[PDB]
Amino acid sequence: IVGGYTCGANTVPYQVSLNSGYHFCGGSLINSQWVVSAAHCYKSGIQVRLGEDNINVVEGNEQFISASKSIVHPSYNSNTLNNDIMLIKLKSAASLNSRVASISLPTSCASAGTQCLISGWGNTKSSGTSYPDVLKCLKAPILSDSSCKSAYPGQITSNMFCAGYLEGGKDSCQGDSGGPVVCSGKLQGIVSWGSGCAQKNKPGVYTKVCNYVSWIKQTIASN
Ligand SMILES: NC(=[NH2+])c1cc2ccccc2s1
Ligand SMILES: [Ca+2]
């Protein structure tokens, strides 16, 4: 996350770190047994880490649970990143408490202009590499589709939306992939892609979760 701030320990209780020997993606806990992340975060051998703040230090509130299965969306296109969403089932249910909680799925899609909270342990420099150990947060509004499409011509589908500042400076970045974009208490997006990070006229592109609620619900009830 570039141009953001330190969240504070466990203030984003639904935030997850996917680890395969090291942290490689973020995710969101939607209920005690399931996590939603980005399909481009797919790997075999994933351990889900809940109640994290510093991911390099066991501070006492963590729960490390292995995944029993991963389900990448049936129509995910790795070339365009269209339908960039994946569900991960935990081998055991997480113990929800003040530090580990689930986030609600949306009942409708949010309006451009709505302010959201984006978080993750990704790079914090636009030009350079600095990976933080504690969770970083960013409040950014959803941009209109017109500004999103003019920034990325022929690349935005109806399953993506842009959030950020066209002036650059604040944005999500690699390492933040799969993480949550929460607006008004609901999970509206998933960190998916962008051109560089915090660049002028290159906002972040997020998977539009409101388009997958039926698929999520149906998939979890049958697995
Ligand atoms: N500009 C951005 N918001 C992003 C850029 C990248 C690049 C790689 C992986 C994830 C992301 S999010
Ligand atoms: Ca830790």
From Swiss-Prot:
The active site is at H40, D84, S177. Synthesized in the acinar cells of the pancreas. Ca(2+) binds at E52, N54, V57, E62. One of its GO terms (cellular component) is serine protease inhibitor complex. Substrate binds at D171, S172, Q174, G175, S177. Residues 1-221 form the Peptidase S1 domain. InterPro entries: Peptidase_S1_PA, Peptidase_S1_PA_chymotrypsin, Peptidase_S1A, Serine_Proteases_S1, Trypsin_dom, TRYPSIN_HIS, TRYPSIN_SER. Its cofactor is Ca(2+). It holds the Pfam family Trypsin. Subsequent cleavage after Lys-125 leads to alpha-trypsin. Further cleavage after Lys-170 yields pseudotrypsin. A cleavage may also occur after Arg-99. GO terms for molecular function: endopeptidase activity; metal ion binding; serine-type endopeptidase activity; serpin family protein binding. Is inhibited by scorpion cyclotide trypsin inhibitor TopI1. It is found in: Secreted, Extracellular space. It is an enzyme of class 3 (hydrolase). Disulfide bonds join C7-C137, C25-C41, C109-C210, C116-C183, C148-C162, C173-C197. It catalyses: Preferential cleavage: Arg-|-Xaa, Lys-|-Xaa. Its EC number is 3.4.21.4. GO terms for biological process: digestion; proteolysis. The keyword Magnesium does not apply. CDD domains: Tryp_SPc. Belongs to the peptidase S1 family. Interacts with SERPINA1. This is Serine protease 1. It comes from Bos taurus.
